[PDB]
Amino acid sequence: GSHSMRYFFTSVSRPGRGEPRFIAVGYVDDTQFVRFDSDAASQRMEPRAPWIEQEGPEYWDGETRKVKAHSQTHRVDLGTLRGYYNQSEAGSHTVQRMYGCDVGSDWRFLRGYHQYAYDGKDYIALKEDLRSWTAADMAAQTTKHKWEAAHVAEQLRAYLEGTCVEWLRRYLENGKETLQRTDAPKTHMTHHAVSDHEATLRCWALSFYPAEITLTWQRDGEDQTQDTELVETRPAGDGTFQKWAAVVVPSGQEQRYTCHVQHEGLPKPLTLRW
C-alpha cells in the first residue's frame, strides 16, 4: 500500500536554565527509526529500528550533522519568535516542526508537507502545491516574506519530491521484512453486566500494525455512533497497537449489535456479534 516518511521536531526554551531541550524523531509509516535528544550522552542521531543499522558510518555522521543544524535553527527561531510576539525572555516557549512525504503503492511521490508551529498553534505551513505558504497571522507573514525571498519553497520542493522519496524507498526496501508487513488485529468481545437491565459490550482490537484502524458499532446493521465510548488508538510498546470501542445496550438485545473492524491487514472487514 501507500507509505510515508516523517520527521518531527520539538524545541522547548529554558531561559537561564540551559540550552533549549531539542527532541527529533523520524518515522517510516508508524515505525520510528531514528531519534536525537539534546539531553542524551551520544549527541548523535541514534537508531530506533533494527533495519536502520544497515546504513553505514557516513549515514550517522551526516544525520548527526544535519540534525544539529536543525537544533541550531530552532534555537535562533525561539529568540526571533519571542520578539515577534513581544514576549518576555523569562518564559518557556515551544517550537514544533513536522515534514515528510507520501508515496503510493508503486513508491512514487504522492504528496509532501512541511509544517511549523509556535506554542502549540499553526504558525506557518507549506501548502499542498509546495510553492506557497499559509501564514497563520501577522507574525507568520514576516516569515512568509522572508522565506519567499530566500526561495525556501524551492528547497523544500526539491527535497520533498526527490530526496525524501528516494530515501523512503531505500528504507522501505531495507526494512521490507517488517515495514511491508501487516499484522491483522487479534479481536474479541467482552460482555459485562452494568445496570440491572443493561449490559456493556466492548470490542477489542489488539496486536495490529499499522496503527490505522476503524471500530464501528451497528445495531440491526445501522451505525450506532451516539451511545458508545471509543478510545484513542494506543501503542502496545512492542511495535503493535491497540484500541477498543464499547456500547451500553439493553440486556437481552445484545444479538442486535455488531462490531465492525476495518484494518488493511484483513482481506475484508470483520463482523463480531457477542
Binding site: 520527521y7 523520524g26 549515514y59 551526516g62 544525520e63 544535519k66 540534525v67 543544524a69 536543525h70 535553527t73 535562533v76 527561531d77 526571533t80 519568535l81 516542526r97 515534514y99 511549523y116 504558525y123 506557518i124 516569515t143 522572508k146 522565506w147 530566500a150 525556501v152 528547497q155 523544500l156 527535497y159 530526496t163 530515501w167
Partner: peptide, 9 residues
Amino acid sequence: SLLMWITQC
C-alpha cells in the same frame, strides 16, 4: 534522511 538545513524563520 533529513533536510541538509532548515532556514531560520
